[PDB]
């Protein structure tokens, strides 16, 4: 036990030091179940321990692996930003950087006024769905005059 | 007379039609019949199909 610290702050977000290490770091945006397992496998960490049982140099090893996947031989087919449209790079985007990357994508579609950008602006379904009977969020209207 | 007087018809409902009455809806491709479903119920006895169950 050692009565060690059981809440910790990692990338401007709070991790509970109380779940299994592979399910604690998925509190970061851009890190799902599948990616969190592969990062800890490259970092040489035992998956059996609770997240409050890592030492100070073990968390810095995990953080420096999450920010640079391609230098620790994580494959290109794993990553969430592929050939990024403005500069051609491959990377994983995390935390408040993922919010801004979506914010730039919706404005890029709106500025040229393509059909995607207009559907996102009017608040309608963007992909191929019908709209007669599903997604209702207004109020019932009466027939009376 | 025009040189462009047809469009491709190598698949879909444009390719196939009934052998008896030239209709395009509800036809049977099973076992090489190529009849319309209303024309099949009319000729089934002469083709040799029967009902038992």
């Amino acid at each position: 036990p050692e009565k060690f610290q059981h809440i910790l702050r990692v990338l401007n977000t709070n991790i509970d030091g109380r779940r299994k290490i592979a399910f604690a770091i998925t509190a970061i945006k851009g890190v799902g179940r599948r990616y969190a397992h592969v990062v800890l496998r490259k970092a040489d960490i035992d998956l059996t321990k609770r997240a409050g049982e890592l030492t100070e140099d073990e968390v810095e090893r995990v953080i420096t692996i999450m920010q640079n996947p391609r230098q620790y031989k994580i494959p290109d087919w794993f990553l969430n930003r592929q050939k990024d449209v403005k500069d051609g790079k491959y990377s994983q985007v995390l935390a408040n950087g993922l919010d801004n990357k979506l914010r730039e994508d919706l404005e890029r579609l709106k500025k040229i006024r393509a059909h995607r950008g207009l559907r996102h602006f009017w608040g309608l379904r963007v992909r191929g769905q019908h709209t007669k009977t599903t997604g209702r969020r207004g109020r019932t209207v009466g027939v009376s005059k | 007379q025009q040189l462009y007087w047809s469009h491709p018809r190598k698949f879909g409902q444009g390719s196939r039609s009934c052998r008896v009455c030239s209709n395009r809806h509800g036809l049977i491709r099973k076992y090489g019949l190529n009849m319309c479903r209303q024309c099949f119920r009319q000729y089934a006895k002469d083709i040799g199909f029967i009902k038992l169950d």
């Binding site: 599948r34 397992h37 592969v38 994580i74 494959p75 794993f78 | -």
Partner: protein
Amino acid sequence: VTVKDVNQQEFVRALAAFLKKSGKLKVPEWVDTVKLAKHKELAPYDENWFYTRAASTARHLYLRGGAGVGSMTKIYGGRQRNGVMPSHFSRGSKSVARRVLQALEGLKMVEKDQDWGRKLTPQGQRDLDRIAGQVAAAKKK
């Protein structure tokens, strides 16, 4: 004692330990990153999964020889959940099955045979019946 005389689950664990102790079986570089089949949601819990896959595959070739890569993907097939739609059957990874069969040929346990497919050698047959006696003796009958 033959492979038909012993309970099959600890036979797979005894054979997996014999392969992994030898040091001769080669493994691919991507063994720590692959999903193992299309219908799985996560990678396997055990770092040692490739030796267990080879041990089970040799046991399959003893009972029913003449298999190939396509018929190994039907043995390791399973159910896929499709989110909000109904579920269906789905086959295993072809590249894993092909590299596991090629890794057993390098131990001289497997041969490509006449007609088409693969089978065990007399040396492969000897090593499996030798481990079936070890599994029976461990129960002190």
